[PDB]
């Protein structure tokens, strides 16, 4: 996250950290006790799935304070339409091997109904993006979880104000190079507040753009995937960690 602030401990309690062999991979978003939403591209290069770990309740990566909860990943589910190495359909649904325990430090973000998300949440101007990614373009990653408030653009306005956005994405942030999500933050939440409650509206995706002047952050538009996610969450797990599921 470029140009944000430390998320105070416990105020981003749905944030997930994903690790591969102990190394930072990506962020994620808890939406129920066994379900995490992240970005498909986070998983393009994984050789051995048993090395993938999800951590909830994390805050400062330099310390153990006892609020952290680590789980193995039993399933990584990716839409059939996603192509590795690209931005379109950049979403994944992760099933944890064992539920996390909800606490003051570990709480799911609400996955909205589609209509509510399209008709109401899509017009909330500002939303929060978070992660332990790079604090600047070509810089070191954050030790403490960072959060940033970013304004959303209608896609026409994004194309005009820019110096390939599909209906499965949206733009948010700033074109002056000051404030953006960055490498290391992919898979994290774009969370939108409405009438006292927070909801999942986007996933940090990727582009050449980490606070690049003339460019906005690109986010996977979660409203397009609500039905797809709900169906998968009612399904039985399948042998083999990676599953490609038809989309739509």
């Amino acid at each position: 996250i470029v140009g944000g602030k430390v998320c105070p401990k416990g105020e981003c309690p749905w944030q997930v950290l994903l690790l591969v062999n102990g190394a930072q991979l990506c962020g994620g978003t808890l939406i129920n006790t066994i379900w995490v939403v992240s970005a498909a591209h986070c998983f393009d290069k994984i050789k051995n799935w048993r090395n993938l770990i999800a951590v909830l309740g994390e805050h400062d990566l330099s310390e153990h304070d006892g609020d952290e909860q680590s789980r193995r990943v039993a399933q990584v589910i990716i839409p059939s339409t996603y192509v590795p190495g690209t931005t379109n359909h950049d979403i994944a649904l992760l099933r944890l091997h064992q539920p996390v325990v909800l606490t003051d430090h570990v709480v799911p973000l609400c996955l909205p109904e589609r209509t509510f998300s399209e008709r109401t949440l899509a017009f909330v101007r500002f939303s929060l993006v978070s992660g332990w990614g790079q604090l600047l373009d070509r810089g070191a990653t954050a030790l403490e979880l960072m959060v940033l408030n970013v304004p959303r653009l209608m896609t026409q306005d994004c194309l005009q104000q820019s110096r390939n956005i599909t209906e499965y994405m949206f733009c948010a942030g700033y074109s002056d190079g000051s404030k953006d999500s960055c490498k290391g933050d992919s898979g994290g939440p774009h969370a939108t507040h409405y009438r006292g409650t927070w909801y999942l509206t986007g996933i940090v995706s990727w582009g050449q753009g980490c606070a690049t002047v003339g460019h906005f952050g690109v986010y996977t538009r979660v409203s397009q995937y609500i039905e797809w996610l709900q169906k998968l969450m009612r399904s039985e797990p399948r042998p083999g960690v990676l599953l490609r599921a038809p989309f739509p």
């Binding site: 309690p13 909800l102 709480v107 799911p108 973000l109 409405y194 009438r195 006292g196 409650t197």
Partner: protein, 55 residues
């Protein structure tokens, strides 16, 4: 009251029905109050709420 306008007055989710009818709904871990629009938590850690700020 129609769901596309002002969220149908609903705090959370909104369904249009046969007539000039509207039904508000609440996510799991919440219940709808008698006003027909508000949602209140029914569990300790409902989604989308930050416990240290609720306390």
């Amino acid at each position: 009251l129609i769901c596309v306008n002002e969220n149908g007055g609903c705090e959370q989710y909104c369904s249009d029905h046969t007539g000039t009818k509207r039904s508000c709904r609440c996510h799991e871990g919440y219940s709808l109050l008698a006003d027909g629009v508000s949602c209140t938590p029914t569990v300790e850690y409902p989604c989308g709420k930050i416990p240290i700020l609720e306390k």
